[model samples]
Structure formats: structure tokens, C-alpha cells
Target chain A: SLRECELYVQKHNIQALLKDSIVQLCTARPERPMAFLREYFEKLEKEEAK
Target chain B: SLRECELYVQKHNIQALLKDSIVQLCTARPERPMAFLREYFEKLEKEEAK
Candidate 1:
């Protein structure tokens, strides 16, 4: 089950990603709640798209 | 290089095996300070025993 799958239709580099005003926690995992489950499906999708 | 190294054990992924521990460094980006790494390595070895 996907909580929220944010689509990035535009080209994304690190700088543009950071401009959205996201929270950066300097402690521990800092990976939002998604860390509880496997998020690699998105990663695989990206790899295949490439 | 070894791929798929995630043994899914309760080590680096969650704790960083390094999270929340006192990072005693005088530098700015306190990511991989030497002092804490030395101690963390020792601690991880002990975990391998069990």
C-alpha cells in the first residue's frame, strides 16, 4: 500500500529537490514514516525508466 | 564491491549503529568524525558475537 506517491514529472537534481522546503532532521533515520516499509519499488521504477 | 549487503539485521540501518550518540567533534559537518567511529566499530564487533 502506498501512502503517497509523489510524481516528479520535471527533471530533478539535488538543488531543485531541496527548493520545495522540506524538513531535514539531523538525527537518526530522518526518513519520514516510509522507513517502516519497503520503498524500493520507486527506486526500481526510476532505474527502469533510465 | 558487494551489492545487496543489507542483512536486514538491527544494526546500521536503524541505529546508524551511530544515531543519537554524542558526536564529539570540533568540525562543522559532523557526519563521519573519527573518534565516534572508533568507538562504534568496537561496539559492532561485540554484536557479532551473538
Candidate 2:
């Protein structure tokens, strides 16, 4: 199972994203993990909106 | 021209990385764009080294 995730990361050339803040947020909260990603964009939108 | 970049953004599901700081670094330096990505991991490696 762990190897599967490792291989997935390796396959996608997303090793950077693997340790990225986005994934760190996921590590913090497995449930609603992607919420950080959505919030990231939403926050950007709000910033640009101003 | 712009459409290709758009399609690339769409196809890879890397829309998140599109606005990410890593990509921002690439945008800031056109001469060696992907260099940022490499430096990112390399930096990570150095961090893990200590």
C-alpha cells in the first residue's frame, strides 16, 4: 500500500507535490484533505478580487 | 500558443501547481523554468540530509 503511493508519486513526477504544503495539509487532516487545495485557490481568488 | 499552455494545464490535472509558488518561480525566470522544480527537490534532499 505504501509502495503503491510511492510508485504513484514516482510515476507522476509529483515527488515535489508529495512533500508540498498541499500534501502537508492532507497529512494534517486526512478527512477533507483536499479542502486546503480548494482554499488555496479560493484564497487566491479573494486576493485577486481585491 | 496560449491554448497549448491551457491544454497542458488541463490535461495534467496540475492546475493546482499552475499557480503554485514553484510554478511562480518558473514564471519569474523564463531562461530555466523547470530549474525551479529541480531546485525544489534538491533543496528537500539537502534538508533531509541534515
Candidate 3:
């Protein structure tokens, strides 16, 4: 849909692909410690993954 | 989010989805790829679809 998936970045004020998703995780799971892989693993633990 | 806007087709595994997307090209208007993308602009009315 986009060249490098970046053509719309400027128009939409984008920063990164997983930026909002990560922020949502931190707020939703405050008990969880802050680690990069932890976030990826936690998301994979969701119902859809299993 | 859904891997380039793909729908979850139970009959198809990942291998089959690629095949199906290609086969569907016949149903698509080859001359106008942009025309096929019209539906994405509207917030599709997700009703109690029967």
C-alpha cells in the first residue's frame, strides 16, 4: 500500500509502527516491568496467539 | 494490522491466502487497481449481517 510503508508518514505525523501499541501496553499493564522483548512476548500471550 | 488488509478465511491457511488473493485478480479489474480500493475509504457499516 505504500513505498517502504512510509509515504503517508509525513501526512499522518507518524513516528513508528509500534509506538502507540507499546504505550497502550505500558498503561494497560503497569505491573509488568519495562523491557522491549517483554512487550513483544506479552502481546503474543493474548488469546489470538494461542 | 491484518497483514495488508487480509480477511481471516478459515478454509485457507497462510499458503492458501496467497493463492486466493492471486486467483481473485481475475475478478479484479486489471486496468484499474485503484478502483478496487474504493471500499477502504468508507467506514464499512458493520451491521447484524446475516
Candidate 4:
């Protein structure tokens, strides 16, 4: 299930991704964190569809 | 502080990114989520750099 998988990813993957410098820098933007994330991921989603 | 922003981004931005269709789908790959995420974000970082 996705939920179980989510936990697994969270437990394992999130730490390393968080360590990335750009990933660290991007969200330090003036935009609210949640807002920045939504826009960022929205672009990613759109990019993936292309 | 970067650390504070990191916490805020972690709490907020990460959630929406996780909800993004591509973000969800990309990691559903055969590669482990950590490996997939590292590659995905690495590509994104490279893309941004270009």
C-alpha cells in the first residue's frame, strides 16, 4: 500500500534528500514553505507530464 | 536561521511535494525510494544549474 510505502520512504529517503544543498536552499525563499512546496511540486508534476 | 527554515519547510513544504503526482509516481519505481529520490533531485539540481 502507498501508506506503508510512504513510511518506508520517509524512514529511509527523506534524510538524505534533506541533506542536499539546493533542496536545502530552495525553500529558504521568501514564500511560505507550504506555498513554495506546492508551487515547486506543481511544476515538477507538470514537467513529468510533458 | 537555515535550520529553522529547514524545520518549517520539512513540516510544510515536504507534505505538498509528497502529494504531487510525479513525486509520488517517480518513487514507486523498482529502485528503492532513497535511490530514486537521490537521482530525481540530483537531476533537478542539475537542471536548475543549467
Candidate 3 on A1-50: residue-level lDDT in tens?
Answer: 43343333332321222333334433334352223223433443342732
For model 1 the TM-score comes to 0.20
DockQ per candidate, 2 decimals: 0.03, 0.03, 0.02, 0.09
- The stretch of ten residues in a row with the least summed lDDT in candidate 1 chain B is B18-27
lDDT of 4 by residue, A7-28 (tens): 5445345544445533655465
Q: Name the Cα RMSD for model 1.
A: 16.3
State which candidate, 1 or 3, has the greater lDDT.
3
| TM-score-sorted candidate list, best first | 4, 2, 1, 3
Task: Give each candidate's fraction of reference contacts reproduced.
Answer: 0.00, 0.00, 0.00, 0.06
Between candidates 1 and 4, the TM-score winner? 4
RMSD of each: 16.3, 16.6, 16.0, 10.7
Q: What is the lDDT of candidate 1?
A: 0.30
- Model number with the top lDDT: 4
Colliding pairs, model 4: none
Residue A3 lDDT in candidate 3: 38
Candidate 3: give the clashing pairs.
none
- For every model shown, the clashing-pair count is 0, 0, 0, 0
lDDT of 1 by residue, B1-50 (tens): 11232233235443442232222222234353323343444444456554
**Candidate 1 CAPRI level:** incorrect
Top of the candidates by DockQ: 4
